[PDB]
PDB file of all heavy atoms in Angstrom:
ATOM      1  N   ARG A 999      21.635  21.811  98.993  1.00 13.54           N
ATOM      2  CA  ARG A 999      20.382  21.044  99.004  1.00 13.54           C
ATOM      3  C   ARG A 999      20.660  19.554  98.793  1.00 13.54           C
ATOM      4  O   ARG A 999      19.986  18.694  99.369  1.00 13.54           O
ATOM      5  CB  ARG A 999      19.370  21.575  97.968  1.00 13.54           C
ATOM      6  CG  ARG A 999      19.356  20.820  96.637  1.00 13.54           C
ATOM      7  CD  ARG A 999      18.084  21.091  95.846  1.00 13.54           C
ATOM      8  NE  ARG A 999      18.107  20.449  94.532  1.00 13.54           N
ATOM      9  CZ  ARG A 999      17.590  20.984  93.426  1.00 13.54           C
ATOM     10  NH1 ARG A 999      17.015  22.184  93.465  1.00 13.54           N
ATOM     11  NH2 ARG A 999      17.654  20.320  92.280  1.00 13.54           N
ATOM     12  N   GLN A1000      21.682  19.275  97.990  1.00 12.28           N
ATOM     13  CA  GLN A1000      22.108  17.922  97.728  1.00 12.28           C
ATOM     14  C   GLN A1000      22.654  17.260  98.994  1.00 12.28           C
ATOM     15  O   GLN A1000      22.316  16.118  99.290  1.00 12.28           O
ATOM     16  CB  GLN A1000      23.150  17.909  96.611  1.00 12.28           C
ATOM     17  CG  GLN A1000      22.676  17.166  95.365  1.00 12.28           C
ATOM     18  CD  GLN A1000      23.559  17.402  94.150  1.00 12.28           C
ATOM     19  OE1 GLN A1000      24.773  17.593  94.269  1.00 12.28           O
ATOM     20  NE2 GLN A1000      22.945  17.392  92.965  1.00 12.28           N
ATOM     21  N   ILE A1001      23.483  17.992  99.737  1.00 15.58           N
ATOM     22  CA  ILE A1001      24.098  17.465 100.954  1.00 15.58           C
ATOM     23  C   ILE A1001      23.010  17.181 101.967  1.00 15.58           C
ATOM     24  O   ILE A1001      22.994  16.114 102.592  1.00 15.58           O
ATOM     25  CB  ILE A1001      25.158  18.436 101.523  1.00 15.58           C
ATOM     26  CG1 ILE A1001      26.476  18.260 100.774  1.00 15.58           C
ATOM     27  CG2 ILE A1001      25.414  18.190 103.001  1.00 15.58           C
ATOM     28  CD1 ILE A1001      27.498  19.335 101.083  1.00 15.58           C
ATOM     29  N   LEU A1002      22.077  18.126 102.088  1.00 14.88           N
ATOM     30  CA  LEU A1002      20.918  17.958 102.965  1.00 14.88           C
ATOM     31  C   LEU A1002      20.053  16.730 102.618  1.00 14.88           C
ATOM     32  O   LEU A1002      19.597  16.019 103.509  1.00 14.88           O
ATOM     33  CB  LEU A1002      20.065  19.223 102.951  1.00 14.88           C
ATOM     34  CG  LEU A1002      19.099  19.371 104.123  1.00 14.88           C
ATOM     35  CD1 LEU A1002      19.863  19.385 105.439  1.00 14.88           C
ATOM     36  CD2 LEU A1002      18.284  20.648 103.956  1.00 14.88           C
ATOM     37  N   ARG A1003      19.834  16.476 101.330  1.00 11.98           N
ATOM     38  CA  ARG A1003      19.072  15.295 100.931  1.00 11.98           C
ATOM     39  C   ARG A1003      19.819  14.020 101.208  1.00 11.98           C
ATOM     40  O   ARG A1003      19.223  12.997 101.562  1.00 11.98           O
ATOM     41  CB  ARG A1003      18.726  15.342  99.453  1.00 11.98           C
ATOM     42  CG  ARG A1003      17.741  16.436  99.184  1.00 11.98           C
ATOM     43  CD  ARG A1003      17.314  16.475  97.759  1.00 11.98           C
ATOM     44  NE  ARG A1003      16.387  17.582  97.603  1.00 11.98           N
ATOM     45  CZ  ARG A1003      15.775  17.894  96.474  1.00 11.98           C
ATOM     46  NH1 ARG A1003      15.995  17.180  95.377  1.00 11.98           N
ATOM     47  NH2 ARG A1003      14.945  18.923  96.454  1.00 11.98           N
ATOM     48  N   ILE A1004      21.130  14.078 101.027  1.00 12.00           N
ATOM     49  CA  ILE A1004      21.951  12.931 101.354  1.00 12.00           C
ATOM     50  C   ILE A1004      21.789  12.611 102.836  1.00 12.00           C
ATOM     51  O   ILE A1004      21.604  11.445 103.196  1.00 12.00           O
ATOM     52  CB  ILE A1004      23.421  13.164 100.954  1.00 12.00           C
ATOM     53  CG1 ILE A1004      23.574  12.887  99.460  1.00 12.00           C
ATOM     54  CG2 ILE A1004      24.365  12.279 101.768  1.00 12.00           C
ATOM     55  CD1 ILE A1004      24.780  13.554  98.834  1.00 12.00           C
ATOM     56  N   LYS A1005      21.809  13.645 103.680  1.00 12.20           N
ATOM     57  CA  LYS A1005      21.691  13.446 105.127  1.00 12.20           C
ATOM     58  C   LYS A1005      20.303  12.922 105.521  1.00 12.20           C
ATOM     59  O   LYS A1005      20.142  12.105 106.439  1.00 12.20           O
ATOM     60  CB  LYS A1005      22.018  14.738 105.883  1.00 12.20           C
ATOM     61  CG  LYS A1005      23.435  15.185 105.695  1.00 12.20           C
ATOM     62  CD  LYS A1005      23.823  16.242 106.725  1.00 12.20           C
ATOM     63  CE  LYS A1005      23.293  17.602 106.340  1.00 12.20           C
ATOM     64  NZ  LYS A1005      24.181  18.698 106.819  1.00 12.20           N
ATOM     65  N   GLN A1006      19.304  13.407 104.809  1.00  8.77           N
ATOM     66  CA  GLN A1006      17.964  12.905 104.968  1.00  8.77           C
ATOM     67  C   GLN A1006      17.895  11.389 104.687  1.00  8.77           C
ATOM     68  O   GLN A1006      17.325  10.603 105.484  1.00  8.77           O
ATOM     69  CB  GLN A1006      17.032  13.717 104.074  1.00  8.77           C
ATOM     70  CG  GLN A1006      16.373  14.832 104.876  1.00  8.77           C
ATOM     71  CD  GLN A1006      15.892  15.999 104.051  1.00  8.77           C
ATOM     72  OE1 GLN A1006      15.696  15.888 102.831  1.00  8.77           O
ATOM     73  NE2 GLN A1006      15.695  17.144 104.717  1.00  8.77           N
ATOM     74  N   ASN A1007      18.520  10.984 103.583  1.00  6.14           N
ATOM     75  CA  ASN A1007      18.542   9.578 103.208  1.00  6.14           C
ATOM     76  C   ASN A1007      19.312   8.755 104.225  1.00  6.14           C
ATOM     77  O   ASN A1007      18.970   7.600 104.479  1.00  6.14           O
ATOM     78  CB  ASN A1007      19.160   9.387 101.829  1.00  6.14           C
ATOM     79  CG  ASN A1007      18.293   9.949 100.712  1.00  6.14           C
ATOM     80  OD1 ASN A1007      17.087  10.170 100.885  1.00  6.14           O
ATOM     81  ND2 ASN A1007      18.908  10.184  99.549  1.00  6.14           N
ATOM     82  N   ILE A1008      20.352   9.352 104.805  1.00  5.68           N
ATOM     83  CA  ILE A1008      21.137   8.647 105.807  1.00  5.68           C
ATOM     84  C   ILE A1008      20.256   8.367 107.012  1.00  5.68           C
ATOM     85  O   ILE A1008      20.286   7.278 107.578  1.00  5.68           O
ATOM     86  CB  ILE A1008      22.356   9.466 106.269  1.00  5.68           C
ATOM     87  CG1 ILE A1008      23.382   9.573 105.144  1.00  5.68           C
ATOM     88  CG2 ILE A1008      23.009   8.836 107.477  1.00  5.68           C
ATOM     89  CD1 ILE A1008      23.730   8.282 104.584  1.00  5.68           C
ATOM     90  N   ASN A1009      19.461   9.350 107.401  1.00  2.21           N
ATOM     91  CA  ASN A1009      18.578   9.133 108.541  1.00  2.21           C
ATOM     92  C   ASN A1009      17.499   8.088 108.253  1.00  2.21           C
ATOM     93  O   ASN A1009      17.169   7.298 109.127  1.00  2.21           O
ATOM     94  CB  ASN A1009      17.937  10.451 109.011  1.00  2.21           C
ATOM     95  CG  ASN A1009      18.925  11.352 109.727  1.00  2.21           C
ATOM     96  OD1 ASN A1009      19.958  10.887 110.222  1.00  2.21           O
ATOM     97  ND2 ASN A1009      18.620  12.646 109.781  1.00  2.21           N
ATOM     98  N   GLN A1010      16.936   8.101 107.042  1.00  2.00           N
ATOM     99  CA  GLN A1010      15.906   7.104 106.701  1.00  2.00           C
ATOM    100  C   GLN A1010      16.522   5.704 106.722  1.00  2.00           C
ATOM    101  O   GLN A1010      15.931   4.742 107.215  1.00  2.00           O
ATOM    102  CB  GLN A1010      15.194   7.411 105.350  1.00  2.00           C
ATOM    103  CG  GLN A1010      14.984   6.144 104.476  1.00  2.00           C
ATOM    104  CD  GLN A1010      13.691   6.124 103.629  1.00  2.00           C
ATOM    105  OE1 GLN A1010      12.586   5.814 104.133  1.00  2.00           O
ATOM    106  NE2 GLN A1010      13.837   6.405 102.326  1.00  2.00           N
ATOM    107  N   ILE A1011      17.742   5.601 106.220  1.00  2.00           N
ATOM    108  CA  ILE A1011      18.446   4.338 106.305  1.00  2.00           C
ATOM    109  C   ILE A1011      18.692   3.913 107.756  1.00  2.00           C
ATOM    110  O   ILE A1011      18.395   2.762 108.123  1.00  2.00           O
ATOM    111  CB  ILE A1011      19.732   4.369 105.477  1.00  2.00           C
ATOM    112  CG1 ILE A1011      19.357   4.328 103.991  1.00  2.00           C
ATOM    113  CG2 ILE A1011      20.609   3.186 105.802  1.00  2.00           C
ATOM    114  CD1 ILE A1011      20.481   4.842 103.100  1.00  2.00           C
ATOM    115  N   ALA A1012      19.160   4.847 108.592  1.00  2.00           N
ATOM    116  CA  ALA A1012      19.427   4.519 110.011  1.00  2.00           C
ATOM    117  C   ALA A1012      18.165   4.034 110.714  1.00  2.00           C
ATOM    118  O   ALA A1012      18.195   3.114 111.541  1.00  2.00           O
ATOM    119  CB  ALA A1012      20.035   5.716 110.742  1.00  2.00           C
ATOM    120  N   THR A1013      17.039   4.639 110.337  1.00  2.01           N
ATOM    121  CA  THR A1013      15.741   4.301 110.922  1.00  2.01           C
ATOM    122  C   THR A1013      15.293   2.896 110.492  1.00  2.01           C
ATOM    123  O   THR A1013      14.869   2.087 111.323  1.00  2.01           O
ATOM    124  CB  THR A1013      14.685   5.416 110.600  1.00  2.01           C
ATOM    125  OG1 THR A1013      15.074   6.622 111.259  1.00  2.01           O
ATOM    126  CG2 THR A1013      13.289   5.047 111.066  1.00  2.01           C
ATOM    127  N   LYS A1014      15.428   2.604 109.198  1.00  2.00           N
ATOM    128  CA  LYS A1014      15.200   1.226 108.694  1.00  2.00           C
ATOM    129  C   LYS A1014      16.075   0.180 109.396  1.00  2.00           C
ATOM    130  O   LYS A1014      15.594  -0.866 109.833  1.00  2.00           O
ATOM    131  CB  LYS A1014      15.431   1.148 107.179  1.00  2.00           C
ATOM    132  CG  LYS A1014      14.221   1.561 106.360  1.00  2.00           C
ATOM    133  CD  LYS A1014      14.508   1.614 104.850  1.00  2.00           C
ATOM    134  CE  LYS A1014      13.337   2.296 104.124  1.00  2.00           C
ATOM    135  NZ  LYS A1014      13.568   2.519 102.664  1.00  2.00           N
ATOM    136  N   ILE A1015      17.371   0.455 109.490  1.00  2.00           N
ATOM    137  CA  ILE A1015      18.280  -0.451 110.192  1.00  2.00           C
ATOM    138  C   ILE A1015      17.814  -0.722 111.625  1.00  2.00           C
ATOM    139  O   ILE A1015      17.918  -1.838 112.107  1.00  2.00           O
ATOM    140  CB  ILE A1015      19.709   0.109 110.193  1.00  2.00           C
ATOM    141  CG1 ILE A1015      20.263   0.080 108.765  1.00  2.00           C
ATOM    142  CG2 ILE A1015      20.630  -0.680 111.182  1.00  2.00           C
ATOM    143  CD1 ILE A1015      21.676   0.579 108.667  1.00  2.00           C
ATOM    144  N   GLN A1016      17.301   0.308 112.300  1.00  2.00           N
ATOM    145  CA  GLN A1016      16.804   0.122 113.660  1.00  2.00           C
ATOM    146  C   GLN A1016      15.611  -0.855 113.687  1.00  2.00           C
ATOM    147  O   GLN A1016      15.536  -1.792 114.516  1.00  2.00           O
ATOM    148  CB  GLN A1016      16.397   1.488 114.196  1.00  2.00           C
ATOM    149  CG  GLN A1016      16.420   1.694 115.668  1.00  2.00           C
ATOM    150  CD  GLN A1016      16.020   3.124 115.971  1.00  2.00           C
ATOM    151  OE1 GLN A1016      15.021   3.625 115.426  1.00  2.00           O
ATOM    152  NE2 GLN A1016      16.819   3.816 116.782  1.00  2.00           N
ATOM    153  N   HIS A1017      14.679  -0.644 112.769  1.00  2.00           N
ATOM    154  CA  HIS A1017      13.542  -1.559 112.658  1.00  2.00           C
ATOM    155  C   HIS A1017      13.958  -3.007 112.348  1.00  2.00           C
ATOM    156  O   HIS A1017      13.344  -3.985 112.821  1.00  2.00           O
ATOM    157  CB  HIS A1017      12.562  -1.037 111.604  1.00  2.00           C
ATOM    158  CG  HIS A1017      12.063   0.347 111.890  1.00  2.00           C
ATOM    159  ND1 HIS A1017      12.284   0.980 113.099  1.00  2.00           N
ATOM    160  CD2 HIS A1017      11.335   1.207 111.141  1.00  2.00           C
ATOM    161  CE1 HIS A1017      11.725   2.178 113.073  1.00  2.00           C
ATOM    162  NE2 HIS A1017      11.140   2.340 111.900  1.00  2.00           N
ATOM    163  N   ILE A1018      15.001  -3.132 111.544  1.00  2.00           N
ATOM    164  CA  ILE A1018      15.543  -4.440 111.186  1.00  2.00           C
ATOM    165  C   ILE A1018      16.172  -5.129 112.396  1.00  2.00           C
ATOM    166  O   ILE A1018      15.949  -6.324 112.611  1.00  2.00           O
ATOM    167  CB  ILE A1018      16.556  -4.309 110.032  1.00  2.00           C
ATOM    168  CG1 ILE A1018      15.812  -4.065 108.703  1.00  2.00           C
ATOM    169  CG2 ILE A1018      17.414  -5.535 109.926  1.00  2.00           C
ATOM    170  CD1 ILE A1018      16.748  -3.525 107.568  1.00  2.00           C
ATOM    171  N   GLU A1019      16.926  -4.379 113.204  1.00  2.00           N
ATOM    172  CA  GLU A1019      17.509  -4.967 114.421  1.00  2.00           C
ATOM    173  C   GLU A1019      16.438  -5.462 115.375  1.00  2.00           C
ATOM    174  O   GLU A1019      16.545  -6.558 115.907  1.00  2.00           O
ATOM    175  CB  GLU A1019      18.444  -3.983 115.135  1.00  2.00           C
ATOM    176  CG  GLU A1019      19.765  -3.854 114.452  1.00  2.00           C
ATOM    177  CD  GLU A1019      20.469  -2.553 114.772  1.00  2.00           C
ATOM    178  OE1 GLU A1019      19.819  -1.610 115.285  1.00  2.00           O
ATOM    179  OE2 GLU A1019      21.691  -2.477 114.502  1.00  2.00           O
ATOM    180  N   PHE A1020      15.400  -4.658 115.574  1.00  2.00           N
ATOM    181  CA  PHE A1020      14.265  -5.107 116.368  1.00  2.00           C
ATOM    182  C   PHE A1020      13.624  -6.398 115.799  1.00  2.00           C
ATOM    183  O   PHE A1020      13.308  -7.328 116.563  1.00  2.00           O
ATOM    184  CB  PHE A1020      13.215  -3.998 116.488  1.00  2.00           C
ATOM    185  CG  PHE A1020      11.905  -4.469 117.061  1.00  2.00           C
ATOM    186  CD1 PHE A1020      11.846  -5.046 118.331  1.00  2.00           C
ATOM    187  CD2 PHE A1020      10.727  -4.336 116.342  1.00  2.00           C
ATOM    188  CE1 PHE A1020      10.630  -5.463 118.868  1.00  2.00           C
ATOM    189  CE2 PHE A1020       9.516  -4.753 116.877  1.00  2.00           C
ATOM    190  CZ  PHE A1020       9.467  -5.314 118.132  1.00  2.00           C
ATOM    191  N   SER A1021      13.445  -6.457 114.471  1.00  2.00           N
ATOM    192  CA  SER A1021      12.912  -7.671 113.840  1.00  2.00           C
ATOM    193  C   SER A1021      13.786  -8.912 114.108  1.00  2.00           C
ATOM    194  O   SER A1021      13.279 -10.005 114.403  1.00  2.00           O
ATOM    195  CB  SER A1021      12.734  -7.482 112.326  1.00  2.00           C
ATOM    196  OG  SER A1021      11.637  -6.636 112.051  1.00  2.00           O
ATOM    197  N   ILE A1022      15.097  -8.723 114.012  1.00  2.00           N
ATOM    198  CA  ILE A1022      16.043  -9.795 114.260  1.00  2.00           C
ATOM    199  C   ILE A1022      15.944 -10.269 115.718  1.00  2.00           C
ATOM    200  O   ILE A1022      15.822 -11.457 115.958  1.00  2.00           O
ATOM    201  CB  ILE A1022      17.467  -9.379 113.825  1.00  2.00           C
ATOM    202  CG1 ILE A1022      17.582  -9.437 112.298  1.00  2.00           C
ATOM    203  CG2 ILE A1022      18.540 -10.249 114.445  1.00  2.00           C
ATOM    204  CD1 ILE A1022      18.831  -8.773 111.778  1.00  2.00           C
ATOM    205  N   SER A1023      15.950  -9.339 116.673  1.00  2.00           N
ATOM    206  CA  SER A1023      15.750  -9.681 118.080  1.00  2.00           C
ATOM    207  C   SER A1023      14.487 -10.521 118.313  1.00  2.00           C
ATOM    208  O   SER A1023      14.516 -11.511 119.046  1.00  2.00           O
ATOM    209  CB  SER A1023      15.689  -8.414 118.932  1.00  2.00           C
ATOM    210  OG  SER A1023      16.921  -7.709 118.901  1.00  2.00           O
ATOM    211  N   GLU A1024      13.384 -10.133 117.680  1.00  2.00           N
ATOM    212  CA  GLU A1024      12.144 -10.903 117.817  1.00  2.00           C
ATOM    213  C   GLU A1024      12.255 -12.317 117.241  1.00  2.00           C
ATOM    214  O   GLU A1024      11.795 -13.285 117.852  1.00  2.00           O
ATOM    215  CB  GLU A1024      10.983 -10.173 117.145  1.00  2.00           C
ATOM    216  CG  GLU A1024      10.647  -8.867 117.808  1.00  2.00           C
ATOM    217  CD  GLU A1024       9.244  -8.869 118.380  1.00  2.00           C
ATOM    218  OE1 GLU A1024       8.277  -8.984 117.589  1.00  2.00           O
ATOM    219  OE2 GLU A1024       9.112  -8.770 119.618  1.00  2.00           O
ATOM    220  N   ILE A1025      12.832 -12.423 116.047  1.00  2.00           N
ATOM    221  CA  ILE A1025      13.068 -13.729 115.449  1.00  2.00           C
ATOM    222  C   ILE A1025      13.900 -14.597 116.413  1.00  2.00           C
ATOM    223  O   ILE A1025      13.568 -15.758 116.672  1.00  2.00           O
ATOM    224  CB  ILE A1025      13.773 -13.589 114.085  1.00  2.00           C
ATOM    225  CG1 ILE A1025      12.811 -12.987 113.066  1.00  2.00           C
ATOM    226  CG2 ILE A1025      14.296 -14.952 113.563  1.00  2.00           C
ATOM    227  CD1 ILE A1025      13.498 -12.583 111.779  1.00  2.00           C
ATOM    228  N   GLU A1026      14.951 -14.015 116.977  1.00  2.00           N
ATOM    229  CA  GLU A1026      15.823 -14.769 117.867  1.00  2.00           C
ATOM    230  C   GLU A1026      15.101 -15.254 119.130  1.00  2.00           C
ATOM    231  O   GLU A1026      15.378 -16.347 119.629  1.00  2.00           O
ATOM    232  CB  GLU A1026      17.081 -13.960 118.209  1.00  2.00           C
ATOM    233  CG  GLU A1026      18.172 -14.027 117.127  1.00  2.00           C
ATOM    234  CD  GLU A1026      19.227 -12.950 117.297  1.00  2.00           C
ATOM    235  OE1 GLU A1026      19.006 -12.042 118.135  1.00  2.00           O
ATOM    236  OE2 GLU A1026      20.264 -12.999 116.591  1.00  2.00           O
ATOM    237  N   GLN A1027      14.168 -14.452 119.636  1.00  2.00           N
ATOM    238  CA  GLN A1027      13.369 -14.901 120.777  1.00  2.00           C
ATOM    239  C   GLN A1027      12.415 -16.033 120.403  1.00  2.00           C
ATOM    240  O   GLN A1027      12.248 -16.995 121.163  1.00  2.00           O
ATOM    241  CB  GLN A1027      12.566 -13.747 121.353  1.00  2.00           C
ATOM    242  CG  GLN A1027      13.389 -12.672 122.024  1.00  2.00           C
ATOM    243  CD  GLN A1027      12.532 -11.455 122.369  1.00  2.00           C
ATOM    244  OE1 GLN A1027      11.507 -11.199 121.717  1.00  2.00           O
ATOM    245  NE2 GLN A1027      12.937 -10.709 123.399  1.00  2.00           N
ATOM    246  N   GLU A1028      11.776 -15.912 119.240  1.00  2.00           N
ATOM    247  CA  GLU A1028      10.889 -16.981 118.762  1.00  2.00           C
ATOM    248  C   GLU A1028      11.639 -18.299 118.557  1.00  2.00           C
ATOM    249  O   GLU A1028      11.143 -19.356 118.922  1.00  2.00           O
ATOM    250  CB  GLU A1028      10.156 -16.586 117.473  1.00  2.00           C
ATOM    251  CG  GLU A1028       8.929 -15.712 117.686  1.00  2.00           C
ATOM    252  CD  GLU A1028       7.729 -16.482 118.227  1.00  2.00           C
ATOM    253  OE1 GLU A1028       7.715 -16.788 119.441  1.00  2.00           O
ATOM    254  OE2 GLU A1028       6.794 -16.777 117.438  1.00  2.00           O
ATOM    255  N   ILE A1029      12.830 -18.230 117.974  1.00  2.00           N
ATOM    256  CA  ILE A1029      13.670 -19.414 117.790  1.00  2.00           C
ATOM    257  C   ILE A1029      14.089 -20.024 119.130  1.00  2.00           C
ATOM    258  O   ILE A1029      14.130 -21.259 119.284  1.00  2.00           O
ATOM    259  CB  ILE A1029      14.912 -19.095 116.936  1.00  2.00           C
ATOM    260  CG1 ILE A1029      14.518 -18.999 115.455  1.00  2.00           C
ATOM    261  CG2 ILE A1029      16.011 -20.163 117.145  1.00  2.00           C
ATOM    262  CD1 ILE A1029      15.667 -18.655 114.529  1.00  2.00           C
ATOM    263  N   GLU A1030      14.389 -19.160 120.100  1.00  2.00           N
ATOM    264  CA  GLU A1030      14.680 -19.624 121.459  1.00  2.00           C
ATOM    265  C   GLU A1030      13.502 -20.426 122.044  1.00  2.00           C
ATOM    266  O   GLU A1030      13.684 -21.505 122.613  1.00  2.00           O
ATOM    267  CB  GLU A1030      15.020 -18.426 122.347  1.00  2.00           C
ATOM    268  CG  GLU A1030      15.775 -18.763 123.620  1.00  2.00           C
ATOM    269  CD  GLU A1030      16.438 -17.528 124.214  1.00  2.00           C
ATOM    270  OE1 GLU A1030      16.131 -16.408 123.743  1.00  2.00           O
ATOM    271  OE2 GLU A1030      17.267 -17.670 125.140  1.00  2.00           O
ATOM    272  N   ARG A1031      12.299 -19.886 121.863  1.00  2.00           N
ATOM    273  CA  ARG A1031      11.061 -20.507 122.322  1.00  2.00           C
ATOM    274  C   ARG A1031      10.795 -21.844 121.624  1.00  2.00           C
ATOM    275  O   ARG A1031      10.419 -22.842 122.267  1.00  2.00           O
ATOM    276  CB  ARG A1031       9.890 -19.552 122.070  1.00  2.00           C
ATOM    277  CG  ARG A1031       8.527 -20.140 122.380  1.00  2.00           C
ATOM    278  CD  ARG A1031       7.399 -19.359 121.711  1.00  2.00           C
ATOM    279  NE  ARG A1031       7.110 -19.879 120.380  1.00  2.00           N
ATOM    280  CZ  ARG A1031       6.135 -20.742 120.116  1.00  2.00           C
ATOM    281  NH1 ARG A1031       5.338 -21.167 121.090  1.00  2.00           N
ATOM    282  NH2 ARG A1031       5.950 -21.170 118.876  1.00  2.00           N
ATOM    283  N   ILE A1032      10.985 -21.864 120.307  1.00  2.00           N
ATOM    284  CA  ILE A1032      10.842 -23.095 119.546  1.00  2.00           C
ATOM    285  C   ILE A1032      11.807 -24.179 120.054  1.00  2.00           C
ATOM    286  O   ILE A1032      11.388 -25.320 120.283  1.00  2.00           O
ATOM    287  CB  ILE A1032      11.042 -22.858 118.046  1.00  2.00           C
ATOM    288  CG1 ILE A1032       9.875 -22.035 117.482  1.00  2.00           C
ATOM    289  CG2 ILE A1032      11.204 -24.191 117.297  1.00  2.00           C
ATOM    290  CD1 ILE A1032       9.957 -21.815 115.970  1.00  2.00           C
ATOM    291  N   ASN A1033      13.079 -23.822 120.261  1.00  2.00           N
ATOM    292  CA  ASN A1033      14.037 -24.787 120.817  1.00  2.00           C
ATOM    293  C   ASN A1033      13.629 -25.294 122.199  1.00  2.00           C
ATOM    294  O   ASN A1033      13.853 -26.462 122.543  1.00  2.00           O
ATOM    295  CB  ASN A1033      15.452 -24.210 120.868  1.00  2.00           C
ATOM    296  CG  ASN A1033      16.060 -24.041 119.488  1.00  2.00           C
ATOM    297  OD1 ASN A1033      15.812 -24.838 118.582  1.00  2.00           O
ATOM    298  ND2 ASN A1033      16.854 -22.992 119.318  1.00  2.00           N
ATOM    299  N   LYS A1034      13.026 -24.415 122.992  1.00  2.00           N
ATOM    300  CA  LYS A1034      12.529 -24.840 124.288  1.00  2.00           C
ATOM    301  C   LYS A1034      11.470 -25.932 124.082  1.00  2.00           C
ATOM    302  O   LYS A1034      11.589 -27.036 124.612  1.00  2.00           O
ATOM    303  CB  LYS A1034      11.965 -23.640 125.054  1.00  2.00           C
ATOM    304  CG  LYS A1034      12.062 -23.748 126.575  1.00  2.00           C
ATOM    305  CD  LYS A1034      13.525 -23.772 127.036  1.00  2.00           C
ATOM    306  CE  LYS A1034      13.935 -25.157 127.574  1.00  2.00           C
ATOM    307  NZ  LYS A1034      15.398 -25.250 127.881  1.00  2.00           N
ATOM    308  N   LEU A1035      10.460 -25.648 123.260  1.00  2.00           N
ATOM    309  CA  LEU A1035       9.373 -26.612 123.059  1.00  2.00           C
ATOM    310  C   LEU A1035       9.839 -27.933 122.475  1.00  2.00           C
ATOM    311  O   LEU A1035       9.331 -28.990 122.835  1.00  2.00           O
ATOM    312  CB  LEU A1035       8.256 -26.042 122.172  1.00  2.00           C
ATOM    313  CG  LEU A1035       7.582 -24.748 122.621  1.00  2.00           C
ATOM    314  CD1 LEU A1035       6.284 -24.540 121.858  1.00  2.00           C
ATOM    315  CD2 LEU A1035       7.349 -24.737 124.126  1.00  2.00           C
ATOM    316  N   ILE A1036      10.774 -27.867 121.538  1.00  2.00           N
ATOM    317  CA  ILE A1036      11.320 -29.075 120.952  1.00  2.00           C
ATOM    318  C   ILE A1036      12.008 -29.912 122.033  1.00  2.00           C
ATOM    319  O   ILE A1036      11.844 -31.141 122.087  1.00  2.00           O
ATOM    320  CB  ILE A1036      12.316 -28.742 119.838  1.00  2.00           C
ATOM    321  CG1 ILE A1036      11.570 -28.132 118.649  1.00  2.00           C
ATOM    322  CG2 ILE A1036      13.092 -29.993 119.420  1.00  2.00           C
ATOM    323  CD1 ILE A1036      12.471 -27.685 117.525  1.00  2.00           C
ATOM    324  N   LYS A1037      12.756 -29.230 122.903  1.00  2.00           N
ATOM    325  CA  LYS A1037      13.444 -29.899 124.008  1.00  2.00           C
ATOM    326  C   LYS A1037      12.466 -30.603 124.962  1.00  2.00           C
ATOM    327  O   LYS A1037      12.579 -31.803 125.212  1.00  2.00           O
ATOM    328  CB  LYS A1037      14.317 -28.898 124.773  1.00  2.00           C
ATOM    329  CG  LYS A1037      15.425 -29.538 125.583  1.00  2.00           C
ATOM    330  CD  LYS A1037      16.497 -28.517 125.949  1.00  2.00           C
ATOM    331  CE  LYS A1037      17.594 -29.159 126.785  1.00  2.00           C
ATOM    332  NZ  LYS A1037      17.039 -29.769 128.030  1.00  2.00           N
TER     333      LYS A1037
END
């Protein structure tokens, strides 16, 4: 049951990391846009 819970936590972490990568991609696009406007 312990090993199974550990694996559960691993998946929740993997899922969070995925959401974080998407957030980073969005930030990077917004920064790209800001640099365009400044230019």
Side-chain angles (χ1 to χ4, degrees):
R999 97 162 176 217
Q1000 244 167 32
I1001 278 169
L1002 199 60
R1003 292 183 181 182
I1004 279 158
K1005 296 195 281 211
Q1006 264 157 20
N1007 292 341
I1008 291 308
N1009 287 339
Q1010 137 146 280
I1011 288 160
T1013 294
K1014 276 174 191 174
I1015 292 181
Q1016 206 178 47
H1017 303 349
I1018 285 164
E1019 284 157 344
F1020 169 59
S1021 287
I1022 284 168
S1023 296
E1024 295 243 296
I1025 290 169
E1026 278 165 350
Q1027 292 171 334
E1028 279 285 77
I1029 283 179
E1030 199 162 11
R1031 174 198 90 97
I1032 291 183
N1033 290 326
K1034 209 65 250 173
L1035 303 195
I1036 291 176
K1037 201 162 179 302

